Design a protein around this nucleic acid. Structure first.
Ligand SMILES: [Mg+2]
Ligand SMILES: [Mg+2]
Ligand SMILES: [Zn+2]
Ligand SMILES: [Zn+2]
Lengths: 198, 190, 152, 60, 50, 129
RNA sequence: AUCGUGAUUAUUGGGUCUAAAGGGUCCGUAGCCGGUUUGGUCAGUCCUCCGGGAAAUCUGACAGCUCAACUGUUAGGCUUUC
RNA sequence: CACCUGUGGCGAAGGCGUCUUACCAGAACGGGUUCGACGGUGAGGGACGAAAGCUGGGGGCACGAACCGGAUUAGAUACCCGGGUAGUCCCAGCCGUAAACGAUGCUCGCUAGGUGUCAGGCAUGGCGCGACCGUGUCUGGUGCCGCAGGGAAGCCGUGAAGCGA
């Protein structure tokens, strides 16, 4: 594998080992073959195989919009989807796109009933809205599980979040918007302004 | 002022545009009767000195300089030769900083824009990659996705040559680079 | 805010400055201004332009700042006030003139609506004043009989 | 600042005939004739009144 | 991680980190404070630019 | 017509925080407005505030130090007892010990943590976090 | 059938430009919502007290039915919102 | 009742274009003017309410449902063309509906900007340095452009479909 950008040269030199220092570098993480060495423990799951099509003069174009979400079950998770003529190349392109979009989300115990403080649930209440699908990340008591959907359980188990209550608004049929709104909520987890004394 | 205000009056630097913006009020000191609003020349030299202090913290071969106008084209090339900075005078490819497989690929650390409104694509590309940019606005410019503002007339040939020579000499003195270029080199061929 | 019956908001306010004291550049006294107010009232001049003529030809910045009393306070103190407020009298006077005009132009429906709006303002003023005991509880605004210029 | 100020200002007009030390408001809505003898100090314009005699000094 | 114009966290993609143009101390800016030109004030040297 | 000045002030603070403006003016100041601003200042969410009188109800020159996320009035001002704060906290607030509810009480106006310490309740006034 | 699903009755907690949906406009009662401010009261409200709010069913444990449900004691709940 | 005429104006909306006069009303603008919360919205209820239609009296140039005739076409009970009644107009009432639309109810505070033009006010340069016209600026309307914001998007965007009451 030939690194191409400055981040690839830095990771091949050994200066950047984990993705946190790469994000601290501030450069664009464009090569899919950098995060695999930075995080060899990356895991992902295909979230749907919804087969799109398209109209032509003679026949009908066919593609696959398979989406795969990537996390590490510790506090890092990312979103990524891709399409191509075959399910294999489509899912592999989605895996390439997802690993470039991994982010670090800080976690704790902000539940009204839970009082542990050790990171097992969302730090506080946040929202994720991709399309009309919206998800609120209300904290949950420890040792309880995710009070969300099956794809929500997959995405939040990839992201490392353990116990959460949620709620869904709008047309929840689109699994792609469900994954993207969960991503938006997790990104709003670590963007709200916290007190300096906390 | 490091250079006398009479020189800025003569060189056309203080001439702006008949219409100004509300965010450019802080760099304007007085409305002229003609319509063209004169900028703050002391503020212009202050911004130039602050940018040269900021540009002196980095090597010239990591800086990026872009320009679009013909009148800003020659002094941009003079800046690129006198510093070694990779300039993009003339037409600009939209995917130079991004698009690693494209010709003209670059991974800078600071961006310089000769005119922020005209060089909008470079501003969007720098904002996408996340590179702070020292810009060169005018009386009818907005500083969106701009880190540092240089209030000078970018539509005057003499003003552009004088401002580019001032920035070049200021940076080259701050970073102890040998600067043997003179303003006639940066002056546009008349 | 919007007006009472037209929603055309406006900001042509009279900007009175923050003055907690009487004038320091004027030699006018409280007795002089109260005498001027009483004489102008006996001439037949309403309180809206009494202060205006005080502030224009005598340059009096405000009667309350110097005398400590507004125009109507001086009017009540000297027994030189009307039995009905000037705003209610003005609205009733305009309504009577508008009704006199509308009794010969029965096609003038726009001014019929204008009369209705002024009637709404008149009932609003009467409701406020009966709330604050300025006018009697049993004296309702009769638009045909008990609406004359001096009501008794 | 945060407080509002009276952009319209007073004057110190001096009477052209009786030399009265009268005071007039600048944005006069009425013909401010002289208090004492015979004069009209300024006429009521919709904006700023047009003064006919000397202004000794514009006040606040 | 804390902007000098808003103080919000630079967890999103597109945060620019740069030293001061007057003293060299690090000053941060977000997309909203950079798209909208929010004035940033350096807490050490007091430098204020648009 | 102006008929909710505390909610207007908190909406202005919300707008100023959303734009990230360090300072903003507060439309006509009130005593409960000053009490809410003082309790919010003691919570550390709001920096500074001064009553600059203008021959009117009075206004504020509030220096927002960038510590809040959203703050509006509580309408209706619900009656609350010492054993009735946690449901309002679970409704408005995002997390335990995160953000406070401005409460008005006969002892004084204060966040519901200090009200629970006082063991006296009353009417909810607002919420800030 | 009915509850939940369904924030598909939505005070919490929905919408109403183009998807069902702003009344043609407007005036306007009951209702409802209401400026800053000194002075007085304390009715809603607030903390507290005292008379109540039958047991039963509810929750937990103890005790005893072999575990169990279940019966008794007991600490809570409801009884509500006088 | 043309051109004049406008991505102008006034009006609660419907709506209003020859001119003169009388009557009336609102607005914005200026205001160290009078008043002191007198305010917003508002189911019921009330008035206004385009055009068509209806009732009674007029008027009828033009236009023009119906109707009659001439073509078109397979047919034409239609488009086309020739006549042309009711009607359009006025006077006195009724009905009370429109895609009565901005498909956006009304009131308030709040929130980057650039950008016409209109009323008023205000500075200044010119103006036969006068009646007048230019640029700047505050306020209130009247349009386009659009960041943030939000929406499913078209989009909206201090004149919200933004954020609260
Ligand atoms: Mg008709
Ligand atoms: Mg409507
Ligand atoms: Zn815990
Ligand atoms: Zn005289």
């Amino acid at each position: 594998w030939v690194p191409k950008t400055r981040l690839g040269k830095l990771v091949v030199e050994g200066q950047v080992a984990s993705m946190d220092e790469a994000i601290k570098s501030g450069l664009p993480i464009r090569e899919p073959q950098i995060i695999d060495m930075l995080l060899p423990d990356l895991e992902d799951e295909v979230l749907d195989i919804n087969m799109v099509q398209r109209m032509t003069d003679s026949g009908r174009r066919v593609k696959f919009r398979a989406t795969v979400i990537v996390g590490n079950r510790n506090g890092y998770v990312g979103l990524g989807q891709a399409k191509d003529v075959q399910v294999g190349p489509a899912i592999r392109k989605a895996i390439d796109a997802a690993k470039l979009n991994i982010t670090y989300i800080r976690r704790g115990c902000g539940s009204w009933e839970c009082a542990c403080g050790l990171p097992h649930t969302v730090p506080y209440e946040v929202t994720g809205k991709a399309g009309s699908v919206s998800v609120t990340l209300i904290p949950a008591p420890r040792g309880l599980g995710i009070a969300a959907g099956n794809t929500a359980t997959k995405v939040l188990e990839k992201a490392g979040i353990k116990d959460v209550w949620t709620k869904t608004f709008g047309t929840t049929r689109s699994t792609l918007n469900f994954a993207k709104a969960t991503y938006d909520a997790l990104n709003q987890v670590n963007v709200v302004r916290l007190p300096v004394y906390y | 002022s490091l250079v006398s205000i009479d020189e800025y009056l003569a060189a056309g630097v203080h001439i702006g545009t008949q219409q100004k913006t509300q965010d450019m009020m802080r760099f304007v000191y007085r409305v002229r009767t003609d319509g063209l609003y004169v900028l703050d020349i002391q503020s212009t030299d202050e911004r130039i000195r602050v940018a040269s202090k900021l540009l002196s913290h980095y090597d010239p071969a990591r800086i990026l300089v872009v320009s679009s106008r013909q009148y800003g084209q020659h002094p941009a090339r003079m800046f690129s030769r006198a510093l070694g900075t990779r300039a993009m005078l003339g037409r600009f490819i939209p995917g130079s900083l991004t698009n690693p497989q494209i010709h003209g690929f670059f991974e800078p650390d600071v961006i310089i824009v000769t005119d922020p409104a005209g060089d909008a694509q470079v501003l969007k590309e720098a904002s996408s990659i996340g590179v702070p940019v020292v810009a060169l606005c005018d009386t009818n410019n907005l500083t969106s996705n701009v880190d540092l503002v240089i209030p000078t007339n970018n539509k005057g040939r003499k003003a552009l040559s004088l401002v580019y020579w001032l920035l070049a000499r200021e940076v080259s003195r701050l970073n102890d680079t040998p600067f043997n270029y003179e303003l006639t080199d940066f002056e546009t061929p008349l | 805010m919007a007006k009472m019956h037209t929603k055309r908001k406006g900001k042509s306010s009279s900007t009175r400055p923050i003055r907690t004291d009487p004038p320091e550049w004027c030699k006018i006294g409280a007795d002089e201004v109260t005498t001027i107010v009483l004489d102008l009232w006996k001439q037949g001049v309403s309180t809206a332009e009494i202060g205006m003529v005080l502030r224009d030809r005598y340059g009096v910045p405000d009667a309350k700042l110097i005398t400590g009393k507004k125009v109507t306070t001086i009017l009540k103190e000297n027994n030189v006030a009307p039995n009905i407020p000037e705003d209610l009298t003005n609205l009733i006077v305009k309504a009577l003139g508008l009704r006199k005009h509308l009794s010969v132009n029965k096609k003038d429906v726009h001014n019929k609506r204008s009369l209705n709006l002024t009637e709404s303002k008149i009932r609003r003023l009467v409701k406020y004043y009966k709330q604050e005991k300025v006018l009697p509880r049993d004296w309702f605004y009769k638009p045909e009989t008990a609406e004359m210029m001096i009501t008794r | 600042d945060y407080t509002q100020r009276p952009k319209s200002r007073f004057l110190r007009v001096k009477c052209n005939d009786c030399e009265n030390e009268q005071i007039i408001f600048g944005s006069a809505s009425r013909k401010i004739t002289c208090v004492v003898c015979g004069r009209t100090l300024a006429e009521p314009t919709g904006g700023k009144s047009t003064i006919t005699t000397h202004i000794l000094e514009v006040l606040e | 991680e804390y902007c000098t114009s808003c103080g919000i966290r630079l967890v999103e993609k597109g945060y620019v980190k740069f030293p001061c143009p007057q003293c060299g101390a690090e000053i941060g800016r977000c997309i909203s404070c950079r798209q909208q030109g929010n004035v940033y004030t350096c807490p050490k040297c007091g430098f204020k630019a648009p | 017509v102006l008929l909710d000045p505390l909610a207007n002030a908190l909406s202005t603070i919300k707008n100023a925080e959303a734009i990230g403006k360090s300072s903003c003016v507060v439309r006509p100041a009130s005593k409960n407005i000053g009490n809410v601003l003082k309790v919010m200042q003691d919570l550390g969410y709001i920096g500074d505030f001064e009553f600059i009188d203008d021959g009117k109800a009075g206004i504020y020159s509030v220096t927002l130090v960038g510590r809040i996320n959203k703050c509006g009035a509580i309408k209706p001002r619900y009656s609350v007892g010492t054993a009735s704060f946690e449901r309002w906290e679970k409704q408005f607030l995002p997390a335990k010990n995160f953000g406070a509810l401005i409460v008005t009480t006969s002892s004084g106006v204060m966040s519901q943590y200090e009200a629970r310490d006082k063991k006296i309740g009353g009417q909810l006034l607002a919420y800030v976090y």
